[PDB]
Amino acid sequence: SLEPPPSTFQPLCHPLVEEVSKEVDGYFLQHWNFPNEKARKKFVAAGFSRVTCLYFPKALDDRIHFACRLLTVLFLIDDLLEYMSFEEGSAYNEKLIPISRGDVLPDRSIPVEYIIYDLWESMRAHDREMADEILEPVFLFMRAQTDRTRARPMGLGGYLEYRERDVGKELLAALMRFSMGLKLSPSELQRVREIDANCSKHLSVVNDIYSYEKELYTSKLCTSVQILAQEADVTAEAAKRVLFVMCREWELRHQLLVARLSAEGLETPGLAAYVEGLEYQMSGNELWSQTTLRYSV
Amino acid sequence: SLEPPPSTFQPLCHPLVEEVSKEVDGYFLQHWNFPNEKARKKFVAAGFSRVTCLYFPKALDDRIHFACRLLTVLFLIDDLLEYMSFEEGSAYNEKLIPISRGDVLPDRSIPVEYIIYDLWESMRAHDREMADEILEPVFLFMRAQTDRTRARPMGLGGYLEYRERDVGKELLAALMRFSMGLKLSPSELQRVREIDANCSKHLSVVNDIYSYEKELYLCTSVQILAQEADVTAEAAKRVLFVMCREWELRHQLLVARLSAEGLETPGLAAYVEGLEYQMSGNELWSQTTLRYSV
Numbered sequence A: 001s002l003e004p005p006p007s008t009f010q011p012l013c014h015p016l017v018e019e020v021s022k023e024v025d026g027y028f029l030q031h032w033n034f035p036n037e038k039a040r041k042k043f044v045a046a047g048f049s050r051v052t053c054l055y056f057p058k059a060l061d062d063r064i065h066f067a068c069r070l071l072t073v074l075f076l077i078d079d080l081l082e083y084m085s086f087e088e089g090s091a092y093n094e095k096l097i098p099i100s101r102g103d104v105l106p107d108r109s110i111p112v113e114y115i116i117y118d119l120w121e122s123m124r125a126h127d128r129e130m131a132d133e134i135l136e137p138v139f140l141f142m143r144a145q146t147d148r149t150r151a152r153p154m155g156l157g158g159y160l161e162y163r164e165r166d167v168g169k170e171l172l173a174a175l176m177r178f179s180m181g182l183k184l185s186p187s188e189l190q191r192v193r194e195i196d197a198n199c200s201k202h203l204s205v206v207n208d209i210y211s212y213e214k215e216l217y218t219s220k221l222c223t224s225v226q227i228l229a230q231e232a233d234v235t236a237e238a239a240k241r242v243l244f245v246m247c248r249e250w251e252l253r254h255q256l257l258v259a260r261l262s263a264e265g266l267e268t269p270g271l272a273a274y275v276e277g278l279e280y281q282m283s284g285n286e287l288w289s290q291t292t293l294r295y296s297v
Numbered sequence B: 001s002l003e004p005p006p007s008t009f010q011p012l013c014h015p016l017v018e019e020v021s022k023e024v025d026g027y028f029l030q031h032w033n034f035p036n037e038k039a040r041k042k043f044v045a046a047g048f049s050r051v052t053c054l055y056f057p058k059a060l061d062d063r064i065h066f067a068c069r070l071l072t073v074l075f076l077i078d079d080l081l082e083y084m085s086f087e088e089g090s091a092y093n094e095k096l097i098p099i100s101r102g103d104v105l106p107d108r109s110i111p112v113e114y115i116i117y118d119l120w121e122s123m124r125a126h127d128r129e130m131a132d133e134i135l136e137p138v139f140l141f142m143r144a145q146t147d148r149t150r151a152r153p154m155g156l157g158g159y160l161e162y163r164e165r166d167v168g169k170e171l172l173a174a175l176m177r178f179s180m181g182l183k184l185s186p187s188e189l190q191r192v193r194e195i196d197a198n199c200s201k202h203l204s205v206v207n208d209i210y211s212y213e214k215e216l217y218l219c220t221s222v223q224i225l226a227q228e229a230d231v232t233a234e235a236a237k238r239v240l241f242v243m244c245r246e247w248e249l250r251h252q253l254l255v256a257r258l259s260a261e262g263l264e265t266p267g268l269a270a271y272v273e274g275l276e277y278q279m280s281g282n283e284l285w286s287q288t289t290l291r292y293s294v
Ligand SMILES: CC(C)=CCC/C(C)=C/CC/C(C)=C(\F)COP(=O)(O)OP(=O)(O)O
Pocket: A071, A074, A075, A076, A078, A168, A169, A172, A207, A211, A214
């Protein structure tokens, strides 16, 4: 049993979600290579633009569609790397990087290539500087998909510390800034490093809780659920419950950290918007993770 | 404030708590060499027999007093050792072991020596077999009252595994069996290893939760989890309290499995319920003992 404990974070959903979802789903159904119509149907049921709209509820109205397209293609690729080597998968993504920079033109007969090319081209055409700024965060993530990670002894504290620097979570934060047109200086971002880390941990542990069965089966792992279960000698289900409570403590910490930024006179209007958006990512990720069929509801 | 989360367990006290407490308190007031009157007031206030009855509420009526006398002298010695060096403390207790065994006569002029001597003689008189079986558990504990703890980097898992082997909790379980007249075979004890480990952690973490402020005046689950999760000690206490409730669920699940499999004997059934009350009793004790105060 997994009844989420009480939370003071209320998730928000972008008002254009219905409009942008059919637009973006419509686009991929027209160009992406879907095998059977069971796939087409399963794709629309996945609601990739829906998650995006829970992650970035305050994205600017003419920018939410870029984020939806980027995460939709990234999720589609994710499904694909699953049935690929390490070498196959690394080769696959790698080709897409120069295409993303616009340095290499796409083969108009390969959907993934032209979809990626046109997407980035459209982002540069809307806001060149901000689009270029999310290039590396996206590539860091893409390359990280196909890792190859040094195995070593890692307890709960080492694991959480590690997730504070998760590149997938840094990507969401970067894409959030682009989507909201939030130009923040590294000086301003310096000021909220603890809030970013705490947020990265919350997102990773909530994903751990809900994707445990998924990962476990495909494993037949490095996740807070298995680690806490082993350290406390309880079942994975019991470990999820305990981690959920820890997630609420990080929600409280987020609030205390935000109040300190403000109290120390370090907040700026851009930082106030940024930290509030991080909160939406944490609560939105929770709602989605517990309802999506991706982790088999 | 710190509100304990919901629990299906509840504290319970031995029915004879009033009579036994008077009987055992009087014995010590008569023999134990308390410095001043104040000491006698503090001693009666600590109510070691009442603590004992909260931990072993299902003890047999004619055996609960042996448990109150043993923990009482052990509590008194604990305090004294506080005013002694490692070496002296070790010699002090080491002198009492042959005496507990009945191998060496006590110096009738030194109360702690004859009190210990007589208590063990009397237990052996009530149930030789069972009295002899709790000898080593008491000595392991007595020798631990003075051993040196080495500091080393320790995560939550390492800490919990260390607490699973806590000699104090081991003592409690062995004395509970003696007090309840439960003679378990090696096969029965082997069968409940996981249940014992789970209970030992529960007792230890609950103690941690409530002893933290006092300790923060080092080696505790409250500080370790707060550092590992990067939250405050109060937050860590809240998370650990929920972990404790999970251990209670686990205790119930493990006992059900024991029974499911044809392995729960009448002795083990009494024993695992006994541990349930040690967990609920320890929680109440932790919440109210002056040992953790200010
Ligand atoms: C294209 C995808 C999934 C993610 C890029 C964007 C992200 C970070 C969205 C946030 C949520 C997400 C599912 C993870 F962080 C990763 O989960 P994990 O790494 O454990 O994979 P799964 O949990 O989905 O199995």
